[PDB]
Every structure is written in structure tokens, then in C-alpha cells.
Amino acid sequence: NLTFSSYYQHTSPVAAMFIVAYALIFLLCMVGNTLVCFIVLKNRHMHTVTNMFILNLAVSDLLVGIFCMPTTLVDNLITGWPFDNATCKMSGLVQGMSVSASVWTLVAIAVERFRCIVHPFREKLTLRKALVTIAVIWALALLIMCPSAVTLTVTREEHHFMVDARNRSYPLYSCWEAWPEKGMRRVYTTVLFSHIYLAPLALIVVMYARIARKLCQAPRASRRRARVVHMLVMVALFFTLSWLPLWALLLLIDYGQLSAPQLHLVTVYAFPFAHWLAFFNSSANPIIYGYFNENFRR
């Protein structure tokens, strides 16, 4: 009983506009990060804590753009996984690292803003503490994504085959997680959902509410305060709504036990949209933090 699949998971126009949209997002992300990095690195007078945090966010977005768009796009275009073991392991590790780094950098930038605004009387942090924070963020990212790189493996499937338009067959594989027991994979996905999506969102929401309350209690000044509040709420909502569907889908596949046609529909259509939104958030961060900054506007 050999199950036959096609080379392309989709038809011609679906692939055409998927490719077009991915190319547009990739080029916009590239241009934004390149310009921001050049502008910050050109001027010596811009050597402040916030600017180096902006640079770290820019490089994290650059990594997400370079090592997460093309691999996922080709993976989603073709049915199988046309790569060997080392690429599967390294790609898992680098993807986890880059996403974690970007999210924690967004949290750190916000906490620096809170420290600057709410309590200006306290001593300001220097460059050494910023470097320590960057180092600890990246180190914790590597440490938390190491086990997934340890267990990830590729298995070659015995009862399936794939055929292209030239009716020529090829083997298939699967980059998956080979746990010793199937029971504690759910624990790992729960801990990932906790350390990537729960704590950063909660911290940003509560502390942005605090700064907004502080600024509200303090006719053009009220307009400036309103514009500040608009920026804060818009960035929080952007992050939350951009990141929710993918994690919801991952939890659903891990727990809800979808049926066969349900699994077909979800893994053919629902995941591409979540990937597109998640990668668009990183590509839209540079415009939001660069064109809305006067210093980088010069």
C-alpha cells in the first residue's frame, strides 16, 4: 500500500502569488534592516542604550529574514523535506534562537522605555549593563533551544512515494522529533509556548499599561499624550495579533487530535498564513521603529 503524492502541494497560481508575497516581504525586510543598521553605525553621536537595542532588534530581524523565509517557503511548496539531517537540526536551532532573540529584544526595549519615563530620578544604565543584557538574552536563547536541536532527526518513509509532472518517482523524508516517549513532547511545546508567547506579552501589556497610566495623570500636550498612547497600544496589538494564530495552531495539532481531512486542510492551508503573518511582523518592525523616529529620519 504505497501512498502517492505530487511534487507541488498547490496549484500554479497559489504558488505564484505565494512566491510573489514572500519576495515582497523579504525585500522590504532586507531594505529596512539594512538602512537602519547603516544609519546607526554611521553616526558616533547616536551611541545610546536605546540605539544599540534598536541595532540588536535589527540584526535579529535580519537573521529571521535570512534563515527562516526561504527554508519554510520551499518546505511549504514541496510535499516532503528535501534536506538532510544536519540542515534540519541547525535550522531548528537557528530559527528558535532568532525568534527568541527578537521577542526578548522587544521586551527589553519596552522595559528601558519604562525605566526612562516612569522613574527619571533613578540612575541611568550605562553601556556595560546593556551589553550584559544582550549577552544573557542570546545565551538563554541558545540554552533553551538546545534540546530541540539534540532530538531532531530525519526518517525516511517506507510506504509513501512522490511523483512530479514527468511521472518520475522520488523518496520522501520527515524532519521530526524522536522523543524516547511520546508523552512529554506536549510538555516541551507547552514550555515553549510559555517562554516565547506568554511572559513577553504579559510583561509588555502590564508595564505599558503602567506607563500609560503615569502619562495620563500628568491642549497640545494632551494631543502628544494621546499620540504616545496610540503608539503604545498599536505596537502591543500588532505583536499579539501577529503571533497568536501560529501558536494556537501548534497547540491544536499537539492536543486536539484533528482527524485526517482536518489535518490535510490545516497543514496545507492554515500554516502558510500563520508563517506569512509571523514573518511579516519582523519585516514591519523596522519601518515602525525607524520612520517614526526623528533621529533615524535624518
Binding site: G92, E157, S174, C175, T267, F271
Partner: peptide, 8 residues
Amino acid sequence: VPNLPQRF
């Protein structure tokens, strides 16, 4: 056996 796309 689980031929579904990778996370992240």
C-alpha cells in the same frame, strides 16, 4: 510519520 511543517 508526522509529515507536517516545522514550527517557527
